[PDB]
From a paper:
A prototype of a Gram-negative epsilon/zeta TA module, the epsilon_1/zeta_1 (ngε_1/ngζ_1) TA system, is encoded by Neisseria gonorrhoeae, an obligate human pathogen causing the sexually transmitted disease gonorrhoea. Thereby, we identified a yet undescribed enzymatic activity. This proteobacterial zeta toxin phosphorylates UDP-activated sugar species at the C4′-OH group of the hexose moiety which eventually causes a lytic phenotype. The toxic activity is inhibited by co-expression of ngε_1 antitoxin, corroborating that the ngε_1 / ngζ_1 locus encodes for a toxin/antitoxin pair. As expected for a bona-fide type II TA system, we demonstrated protein-protein complex formation between ngε_1 and ngζ_1, which assemble into a heterodimeric complex.
To this end, we first determined the crystal structure of the catalytically inactive ngε_1/ngζ_1(K115A) selenomethionine substituted protein complex at 2.4 Å resolution using single anomalous dispersion experiments. We found four heterodimeric ngε_1/ngζ_1(K115A) TA complex molecules located in the asymmetric unit, a complex arrangement which we also observed in solution. In fact, not only the quaternary structure is set apart from known zeta toxins, but also the tertiary structure and mode of inhibition is very different to other zeta toxins. Strikingly ngε_1 binds as an extended polypeptide stretch onto the molecular surface of ngζ_1 and does not fold into a globular domain. Furthermore, the C-terminal part of the first helix, the second helix and the connecting loop region of ngε_1 cover the potential ATP binding site. In addition, also the tertiary structure of ngζ_1 is different to known zeta toxins, as it consists of two domains. Although our initial analysis of the primary sequence did not identify these homologues, a structural alignment revealed that two sequence blocks were shuffled by swapping position within the polypeptide chain. Yet, two loop regions were topologically rewired in ngζ_1 when compared with other zeta toxins leading to a similar tertiary structure albeit these two blocks occur at different position within the amino acid sequence. Nevertheless, residues that have previously been shown to be important for enzyme catalysis are found to be structurally conserved in ngζ_1. Finally, the C-terminal domain has the fold of an oligonucleotide/oligosaccharide binding domain (OB-domain) and consists of a five-stranded Greek-key β-barrel that is in an open distorted conformation capped by a short α-helix.
Residue numbers in the entry:
A (entry chain B): 2 to 381, 386 to 395
B (entry chain A): 7 to 60
Write the structure that this text describes.
């Protein structure tokens, strides 16, 4: 039994560690394919090799043995595990078992409890194969689905769904108990593109592939019709979800809900500064007075309503449109009172108008260096107090 | 009428609801998910990895 394909290499760059883990995983998966599939079938928690998932195959790689390494090596071993899954998928398909006619594909944003849903499915006598994996980029799944339909098997795809924020909370717990969480990049990519992938499957294969959904934000409600599955899964664009996730994991870290390790694996390879800079404030203003600052948003019909009040002493009366702030040019120094701050931005009143600084600058955290109401200078990262009494 | 896989999925949803209101049940599902390789499997893997070092 050989691998059903060559394993694709990712580019790890100057990281020699991950680059060598990658080649070790590929060598293991390519040369010991037979003994690996046999251990997976006879000895792992896989229903005799019928539950096929790349994340279960990861546990048979030496680099994944120790809990504290799993977040770091995951990307480096993934493709090897996924091709091992396809090989396994094909070996289950080749077994002559006319009784078993049903193939179930289960997918969802990480932390949506898709794996837990699979574990709570009980194998029936007609169940041939259970595959769990991403269908946001469905090309790989096309090859699997084709083979099912060549053999007259009935295919069902189950889309498990949850808001990114709550799924993110579940990924933290998994990182802490098991050692693997999930990057905000893959979470956003998946939740944004999953509908498109399911669309591409419906348009290639038709009614032949039954597509259903499980909404975990409505107490695991089963959703039967395709059009309704697409509705439930419309939870924002990739930029919107990524932007929201970046703000969450930064606030969660800044307030002490997550360790630095948990924050770094959630960060993944994202430049947070570049996400935070894309955030828009066009319908938002800040009203300052002697009691504090109030963040307000405008509705379509020009009405302002309150979002957040922060108590602060010593500020004068003011109204600042946040969407008209000037971006801070790099290398220049800006002086004056911080009037508002959040996870993504710091707004500063200078002599040349309101200025916006990214809340992170080259992986250093600007927002924690300054308080709302404080007179400061910001340049480059050099922050100085300008506070005095005369 | 409804296929078998679709019943299995509905039954799975009911068990997901049970997890929300039964701490002991959730904890045995989550213990199984994150268990990792059994000592029996891990013994077999060790032989496998060690025999095929470069």
């Amino acid at each position: 039994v050989k691998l059903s394909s060559d394993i694709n290499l990712r580019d790890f760059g100057n990281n020699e560690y991950l680059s060598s883990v990658q080649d070790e995983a590929i060598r293991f998966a390519t040369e010991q394919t037979d003994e690996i599939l046999s251990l997976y079938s006879q000895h792992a928690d896989t229903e005799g090799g019928r539950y096929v998932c790349a994340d279960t195959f990861k546990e048979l790689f030496p680099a994944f043995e120790n809990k504290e390494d799993r977040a770091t090596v995951n990307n480096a071993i993934h493709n090897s595990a996924a091709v091992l899954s396809s090989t396994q998928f094909d070996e289950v398909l080749k077994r002559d078992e006319p009784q078993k006619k049903e193939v179930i594909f289960v997918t969802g944003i990480p932390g949506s409890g898709a794996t837990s849903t699979v574990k709570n499915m009980m194998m029936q006598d007609t169940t041939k194969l259970l595959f769990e994996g991403q269908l946001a980029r469905p090309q790989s799944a096309f090859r699997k689905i084709e083979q099912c339909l060549e053999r007259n098997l009935e295919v069902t795809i189950v889309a498990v769904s949850m808001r990114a924020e709550r799924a993110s909370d579940n990924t933290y717990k998994r990182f802490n108990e098991y050692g693997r969480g999930a990057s905000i990049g893959i979470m956003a990519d998946i939740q944004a593109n999953l509908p498109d992938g399911l669309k591409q499957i419906r348009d290639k294969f038709g009614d032949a592939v039954k597509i259903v959904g499980i909404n975990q934000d409505r107490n695991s409600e089963f959703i039967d019709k395709f059009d309704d599955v697409i509705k439930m899964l419309s939870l924002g664009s990739q930029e919107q979800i990524l932007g929201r996730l970046a703000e969450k994991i930064q606030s969660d870290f800044d307030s002490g809900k997550i360790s630095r390790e948990c924050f770094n694996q959630a960060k993944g390879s994202m430049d947070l500064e570049s996400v935070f800079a894309k955030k828009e404030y066009s319908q938002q203003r800040v009203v300052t007075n002697s009691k504090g600052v109030t963040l307000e948003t405008k509705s379509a019909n020009e009405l302002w309503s309150k979002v957040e009040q922060i108590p602060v002493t010593g500020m004068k009366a003011g109204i600042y449109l946040l969407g008209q702030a000037k971006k801070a040019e790099t290398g220049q120094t800006y002086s004056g009172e911080i009037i508002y701050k959040d996870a993504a931005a710091v707004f500063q009143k200078t002599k040349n108008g309101l200025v916006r600084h990214n809340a992170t600058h080259n992986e250093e955290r600007l927002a924690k260096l300054v308080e709302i109401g404080q007179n400061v200078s910001i340049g480059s990262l050099i922050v100085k107090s300008l506070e005095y009494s005369a | 009428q409804e296929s078998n896989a679709i019943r299995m999925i509905k039954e799975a949803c009911e068990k997901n609801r049970r997890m929300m209101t039964d701490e002991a049940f959730r904890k045995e599902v989550e213990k199984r998910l994150y268990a990792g390789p059994s000592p029996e499997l891990l013994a077999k893997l060790r032989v496998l990895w060690a025999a095929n070092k470069e």
